Paper text:
Ionotropic glutamate receptors (iGluRs) encompass a family of tetrameric glutamate-gated cation channels that mediate the majority of excitatory neurotransmission in the vertebrate central nervous system. The ECD consists of a distal N-terminal domain (NTD) and ligand-binding domain (LBD). The full-length structure of the GluA2 AMPAR provided a first view of the modular arrangement of the individual subunits of iGluRs (Sobolevsky et al., 2009).
Overall, GluA4 resembles other AMPAR (GluA1–GluA3) NTDs with root-mean-square deviation (rmsd) values of ∼1.2 Å when superimposing individual NTD protomers and up to 4.1 Å when superimposing the NTD dimers. GluA4 exhibits interface characteristics similar to those of GluA2 (UL interface LD: 43.7, LL interface LD: 37.2).
Residue numbers in the entry:
A (entry chain A), B (entry chain A): 2 to 380
The structure:
């Protein structure tokens, strides 16, 4: 087994913090005082691309492929998910990603991000929502939209779905205005953080951040966002929190996170978002995987592969099958809790806290896990 | 100007008829008795691939790119739209496609298929639908879904959206059953032809093909499908028909179409579907485009380009800009009527007939064009 293991790093636009987390995890691994933890070094070959279109991601993949990576830690969006996952499976180069889960690809894709679908639907039931509007964007695909619209159709919900991509201050006013005329009181928001911040501001500019309005934020990082105004406005706001900041592992990470040079490690100036936590865990998963391969006595090597992604015929890495099988057997504790997978490479046996906004600030009102579903606190 | 022009042909799964149309148009061009029509020959370099995943489409593109094609006539689906359009724009190789329109790509993509969005929404208004279910699949993206759900949210429609991908006879029964319990009477169906045929059968097995049920079929080929049972059942069925079979141009095509050897030209056994008509027009558009380039005295050549799609830096074809600009200026008559485009490469100044199902069979009840919108017949 090699003393150095080559892995790919494929990051896209506005993922500075995630890359900072990637770098920290790798540093902590390579400088570990524990020979058992680090019998090999991780040598990342990284592309940080700002466009993230399909052509550029394909070129990045092929560049990493020719540099002989055994696996790729990679992010994608709607525009690149298909090429990246397709090239990975075709060539048996395992993809480890913190990006939105995707059912299509079923081999060579390990999806660190657990599904929010069940939790979100369970929540809507508990609250007995029947008429609400769904504000959203499509950067992370259409799964949540489809899940909501299907649940709505089977339950006689009157849901008004509205895409807010490319809305300006005017679009919103009009949007928030009409909304005002219909007297919409309940909302589910599913957007990128940047867009989320903006919508929330608009709602506050509108004065619908007061009681009694209710907002459910459909993401895994309730605490990643500033809700000060809503805490003061008095509106209901519910969300999910995958990362538990009151645990030793997260605490220890935070201890180091706060000491990072914010100029050299952009994104360290704020606490890690859930995507950054997922990225850190991804490195933990890869480290465990290579330790396992080593125990299995599988001397991973890509010699003497041509290194050409467009080679005809395609020449898939023969040891890729072992890598992929071993990845999915990983079961470790991470920033995002129990990290464990099914054969499709999807997270299973996981939990997330459910938070509500109270005067005192965010308060935990329960949790959701894939075995018990929604469990609220009660005396 | 070369006497032979190299073009790409990228066809995916179950596109036999479309390729048959492609071949016929090219044959009719190369064997034209008219020197003005054919001052050059069209030399297609074709890939007919059965999987149609992103890896295979990228490899096909690169193979055609290295064979020195000036443009590519290509089909895609949700899985390949991004790679194909991305590679085309990056390398200034114009894509001419009959596939579902896509707003993202704004250069080097000419979209032969006109939008159905306005027509469909106009239709729902005319009929004053407020409560209906939307049966659909996602092979052609989510535009129609989004358009419906947004229109619904702004108009207080109670729409129940249901995706039917991967439904079997059991899924449908349950589906059609529950539907029965809710007493759903009105439906919009937006699926692939194969899936459409199947749903329609299920509905007939259910007995909801009678009066008074209403079905709106959201596609451009009302006549492409067998509705015999519904003609007899007595249900309302409305749809759109882009190709006018009672015109000299279509008639002449049909004259030759029916004489095709159905073994050598699979798909000729039935009348051309609207996608096949679009494919034929695509060749007409390319022929006109090359005739225009010739008049402009633009001696198109890709010498001595490396021919490597993954070349760094990317070396876009310098004459690609002219090709792309000229494509979009094309204005000709085709099987699908007036073929004309805006600078985004989208169809404009087009019309489609609106058909209803009557005892006598399909009867035209009006039309929709992008200037007049919905115009119904009335005494
Ligand atoms: C605001 O959120 C509170 C959360 O407490 C909602 O009240 C809860 O509703 C659930 C389900 O209806 C009950 O099981 C809890 O007992 C309720 N808690 C309390 C303290 O009342 C409330 O419905 C929401 N109100 C609005 C206007 O959105
Ligand atoms: C869910 O995950 C936990 C680990 O986070 C699993 O608990 C472990 O189970 C093993 C047996 O396989 C015990 O030996 C360990 O002591 C447990 N660790 C704990 C409790 O921290 C649990 O088995 C998983 N449940 C599933 C997969 O159904
Ligand atoms: C079935 O379709 C017929 C189409 O004629 C519908 O009747 C038309 O409705 C439109 C708009 O309401 C009117 O402008 C036409 O004058 C109507 N035509 C006729 C002949 O009545 C009818 O509403 C549909 N019925 C059902 C049950 O779906
Ligand atoms: C819509 O398309 C038709 C062609 O199908 C255009 O009609 C032509 O207009 C030109 C002037 O540019 C006339 O010289 C031709 O005689 C017309 N051909 C016909 C009527 O068959 C029409 O201009 C287009 N309208 C638009 C683009 O607004
Ligand atoms: C050393 O690393 C191995 C593998 O990660 C682990 O089992 C062990 O607990 C570590 N030892 C210490 C002292 O942390
Ligand atoms: C010959 O082709 C040119 C260009 O397509 C066209 O303008 C002309 O009408 C054609 N002539 C005949 C007789 O069809």
């Amino acid at each position: 087994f090699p003393s150095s293991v080559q892995i790919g790093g494929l990051f896209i636009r506005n993922t500075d913090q995630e890359y900072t987390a990637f770098r920290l995890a790798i540093f902590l691994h390579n400088t570990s005082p524990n020979a058992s933890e680090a019998p090999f070094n991780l040598v990342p070959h990284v592309d940080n691309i700002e466009t993230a279109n399909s052509f550029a991601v394909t070129n990045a993949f092929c560049s990493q492929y020719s540099r002989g990576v055994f696996a790729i830690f990679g992010l994608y969006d709607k525009r690149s998910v298909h090429t990246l996952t397709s090239f990975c499976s075709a060539l048996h180069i395992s993809l480890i990603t913190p990006s939105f889960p995707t059912e299509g690809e079923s081999q060579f894709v390990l999806q660190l991000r657990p599904s929010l679908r069940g939790a979100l639907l369970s929540l809507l039931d508990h609250y007995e929502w029947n008429c609400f509007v769904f504000l959203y964007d499509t950067d992370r695909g259409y799964s949540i939209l489809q899940a909501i619209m299907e649940k709505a159709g089977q339950n006689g919900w009157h849901v008004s779905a509205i895409c807010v991509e490319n809305f300006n201050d005017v679009s919103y006013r009009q949007l928030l205005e009409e909304l005002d005329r219909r007297q919409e009181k309940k909302f589910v928001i599913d957007c990128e953080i940047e867009r989320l911040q903006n919508i929330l501001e608009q709602i506050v500019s509108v004065g619908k951040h007061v009681k009694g309005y209710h907002y459910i934020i459909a993401n895994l990082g309730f605490k990643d966002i500033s809700l000060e105004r809503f805490i003061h406005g008095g509106a209901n706001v519910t969300g999910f929190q995958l990362v538990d900041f009151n645990t030793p592992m997260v605490t220890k990470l935070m201890d180091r996170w706060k000491k990072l040079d914010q100029r050299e490690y952009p994104g360290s100036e704020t606490p890690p978002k859930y995507t950054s936590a997922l990225t850190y865990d991804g490195v933990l998963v890869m480290a465990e995987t290579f330790r396992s391969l080593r125990r299995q006595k599988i001397d991973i090597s890509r010699r003497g592969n041509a290194g050409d992604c467009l080679a005809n015929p395609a020449a898939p890495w023969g040891q890729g099958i072992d890598m992929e099988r071993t990845l999915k057997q990983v079961r470790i504790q991470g920033l995002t809790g129990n990290v464990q997978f099914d054969h499709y490479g999807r997270r299973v046996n996981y939990t997330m806290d459910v938070f509500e906004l109270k005067s005192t600030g965010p308060r935990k009102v329960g949790y959701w896990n894939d075995m018990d579903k929604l469990v609220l606190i009660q005396d």
